[PDB]
């Protein structure tokens, strides 16, 4: 019975991400991934972050993308990483529908670079959110490179 | 001699001297001051320019007044463009080719005076619609002079006027467009666009201009952070800090010691070092930024004069020629631009 | 009161009291007199207080939509602040760095505090 109350209060937390001035969103984005990792198993937060990360009713996904990066990085144990990869498959089938195309390829590049391997892919992720829009051929190069680096991940 | 104690009677006498066709350029010169002042002389100058522009508005088939009035009084013409008679004069210059070309030439000779935002907005409202044979000259003036302003709305307005200008250039005849706009000047415009940063800031002008032309993983990450960090100046501040954060950190003093380095990233690097140290285990970002901050402070005080004398902002250049050294290496925009960056860095450090 | 809440750094309270001031002076102002001075100060500080805390479109009242539609009073101040709204929604640093040195004498002290807070939270 306490699980649905936890779902309700996590929904109120995401509601305070929905509205809210950017300092408040910085605070909720910083305190979020530790709370979501520590409180309950990650399937519910996975469903919630995919269902409330690609919403058109969202002011800006950048700190939410940092939330995505940290919640993927705290799920990098072995069977948990296979579950992560299955969630990447489900969420990329969700990504098959097109958003506004510049933000679409941007958020898809963030999702590729976040749930990824160890050595040098993660450190690019502040640079991917360094431009939110502004699609350029160099962004296509970075997106194709993280795509072919995820193709050898599977 | 009546001009100073009473302006309004001299403005009446200007209109009387206009209604009978007495146009001696010596008297209109000594009234309108052809190349702190008083107030009545300014009222007389503005009134004389207005009534003279209405005189050229009435009888315009005699066209020496247009050339003389546009060449000589050009800045003081556009400063008054929200009054009806000089507005009719402006709309009368918009129906001539040679007068509008001389007008854009006169703006080109005196563009450095049109640096205030109000006079520049009034030139943009005064170059709003001109004669169609003069479109190449106003496009060269738009891309050469009036696009490099720091004000963004004036850049936006001159962008919209330039895009409408190329749109009106394309709808006309191609033999009319090619005969006015040369190709080498077009390559000059395109290299001026691609030289500065206004090419990627404005997609529409470059797209329409190329349309008019065509009508006729380790070291790679090091290269990426060299692309992001080693620039002149940018808005990427926390982002550059997190980019230099995941450097292997056995080679930091190799990276920070560079001739072309964003020293403005040093204070966010120190803030990230503070967050990592107060969170848990120490960082190399903090000690790297500390070393290069103190080394650059020692360098920029090694460039200071040795025997220091006390500042006095009441009589600066009086005691010695030491102020030659405190204007030479001290008023230079490079070292002066480098100092408060290191002041932000030392503020975070202290 | 707005100067007090700006001292105690309740900026959203200053936004609420500034839109209440503009609502009152519009309702009683035909501007008539000193109501013009109120509208000038409130229009400069509400623009700077909208660029300081950039609201989401959910909490954005339609009055703020009207002012940011007007931006996306003396002439040099309107032109420089309109250029400053464009240079901030572009996020162009050197534009603002050269805009403040021209905008300093045209504003009072507390509005300069708000503009420095704008310049800090883009840098």
CA pair distance C40, C46, nearest whole angstrom: 10
The Cβ of residue A127 has, within 10 Å, a number of other Cβ atoms equal to 20
Resolution (A): 4.1
Distance (Å) from the alpha carbon of B221 to chain A's nearest alpha carbon: 7
**3 state DSSP class of B62:** coil
A104: phi then psi, degrees, rounded to nearest 5:
-65, -55
CA pair distance A131, B51, nearest whole angstrom: 56
Of B117, B233, B237, the CB nearest to C79: B117
Length of chain A in residues, anyone?
154
CA pair distance A32, A17, nearest whole angstrom: 10
Cβ neighbours of B266 in C, within 8 Å: none
**Is C91 in contact with B235 (Cβ distance < 8 A)?**
yes
Residue B155: exposure state from Cβ atoms within 10 A (0-12, 13-18, ≥19)? buried
CA pair distance B14, B22, nearest whole angstrom: 10
Of C12, C53, C56, the CB nearest to A59: C56
- The answer to whether residues B104 and B134 touch, using CB atoms and an 8 Å cutoff, is yes
**Is B246 in contact with A123 (Cβ distance < 8 A)?**
yes
Please compute, for residue C39, the number of CA atoms within 13 A of its CA located in the half-sphere on the CB side.
18
Give CA separation, B18 vs B2, B4, B15, B52, B54, in Å.
18, 20, 5, 8, 10
The residue of chain B with its CA nearest to that of A124 is B243
The residue of chain B with its CA nearest to that of A136 is B200
Shortest CA distance to B140 belongs to which of B66, B202, B209? B209
Of B218, B224, B245, the CB nearest to A124: B224
Q: Across the B/C interface, how many CB contacts are shorter than 8 Å?
A: 40
- The answer to whether residues B285 and B272 touch, using CB atoms and an 8 Å cutoff, is yes
CA pair distance B10, B47, nearest whole angstrom: 9
CA pair distance B104, B178, nearest whole angstrom: 20
Cβ neighbours of B340 in C, within 8 Å: none
Own/partner pairs for A14-19, CB < 8 Å, 24+ apart?
A14/A48, A14/A52, A17/A52, A17/A64, A18/A57, A18/A58, A18/A59, A18/C56, A18/C58, A19/C56, A19/C58, A19/C59
The Cβ of residue B80 has, within 10 Å, a number of other Cβ atoms equal to 15
């Amino acid at each position: 019975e306490s699980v649905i109350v936890a779902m309700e209060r996590v929904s109120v937390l995401f509601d305070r991400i929905r509205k809210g001035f950017p300092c408040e969103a910085r605070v909720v984005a910083r305190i979020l991934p530790q709370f979501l990792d520590d409180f309950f198993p990650p399937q519910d937060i996975m469903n919630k972050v995919i269902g409330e990360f690609l919403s058109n009713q969202q002011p800006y996904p950048q700190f939410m993308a940092t939330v995505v990066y940290k919640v993927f990085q705290t799920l990098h144990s072995t069977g948990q990483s296979s579950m992560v990869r299955d969630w990447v498959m489900l969420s990329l089938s969700n990504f098959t529908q097109r958003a506004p195309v510049a933000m679409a390829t941007w958020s898809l590049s963030c999702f590729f670079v976040s749930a990824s391997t160890s050595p040098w892919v993660a450190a690019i992720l502040p640079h991917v959110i360094s431009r939110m829009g502004k699609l350029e051929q160099v962004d296509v190069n970075l997106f194709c490179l993280v795509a072919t680096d995820f193709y050898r991940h599977q | 001699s009546m001009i100073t104690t009473h302006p309004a009677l001299v403005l009446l006498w200007c209109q009387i001297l206009l209604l009978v066709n007495h146009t001696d350029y010596r008297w209109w010169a000594e009234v309108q001051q052809t190349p702190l002042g008083m107030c009545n002389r300014e009222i007389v100058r503005r009134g004389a320019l207005i009534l003279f522009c209405d005189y050229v508005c009435q009888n315009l088939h005699d066209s020496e007044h247009l050339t003389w009035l546009i060449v000589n009084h050009i800045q003081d013409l556009i400063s008054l463009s929200h009054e009806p008679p000089v507005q009719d004069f402006i709309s009368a210059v918009h129906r001539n080719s040679a007068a509008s070309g001389l007008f854009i030439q006169a703006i080109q000779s005196r563009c450095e005076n049109l640096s205030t935002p109000t006079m520049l907005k009034k030139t943009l409202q005064c170059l709003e619609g001109i004669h169609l044979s003069q479109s190449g000259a106003v496009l060269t003036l738009y891309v050469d002079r009036l696009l490099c302003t720091p004000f963004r709305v004036l850049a936006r307005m001159v962008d919209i006027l330039a895009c409408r200008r190329v749109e009106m250039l394309l709808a006309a005849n191609l033999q009319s467009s090619m005969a006015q706009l040369p190709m080498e000047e077009l390559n000059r415009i395109q290299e001026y666009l691609q030289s500065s940063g206004l090419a990627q800031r404005h997609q529409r002008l470059y797209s329409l201009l190329d349309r008019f032309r065509l009508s006729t993983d380790k070291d790679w990450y090091v290269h990426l952070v060299k692309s992001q960090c080693w620039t002149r100046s940018d808005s990427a501040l926390l982002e550059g800090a997190e980019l230099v954060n995941r450097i292997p950190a056995e080679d930091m003093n190799a990276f920070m010691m560079n001739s072309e380095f964003n020293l403005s990233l040093l204070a966010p690097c120190l803030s990230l070092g503070m967050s990592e140290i107060s969170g848990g285990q120490k960082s190399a970002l903090f000690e790297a930024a500390r070393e290069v901050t103190l080394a650059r402070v020692s360098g920029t005080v090694q460039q200071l004069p040795a025997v220091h004398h006390v500042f006095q902002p009441e009589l600066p250049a009086e005691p010695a020629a030491y102020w030659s050294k405190l204007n030479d290496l001290f008023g230079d925009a490079a070292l002066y631009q480098s100092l408060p960056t290191l002041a932000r860095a030392l503020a975070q450090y202290l | 009161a707005a100067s007090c809440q700006l001292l105690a750094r309740d900026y959203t309270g200053a936004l609420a009291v500034f839109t209440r001031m503009q609502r009152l002076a519009r309702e009683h102002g035909s501007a008539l007199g000193a109501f013009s001075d109120v509208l000038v100060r409130c229009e400069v500080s509400r623009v700077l207080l909208l660029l300081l805390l950039q609201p989401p479109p959910a909490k954005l009242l339609p009055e703020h939509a009207q002012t940011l539609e007007k931006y996306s009073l003396p002439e040099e101040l309107f032109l420089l602040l309109q250029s400053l709204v464009m240079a901030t929604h572009e996020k162009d640093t050197e534009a603002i760095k050269s805009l403040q040195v021209e905008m300093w004498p045209l504003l009072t002290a507390e509005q300069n505090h708000l503009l420095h807070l704008v310049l800090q939270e883009t840098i």
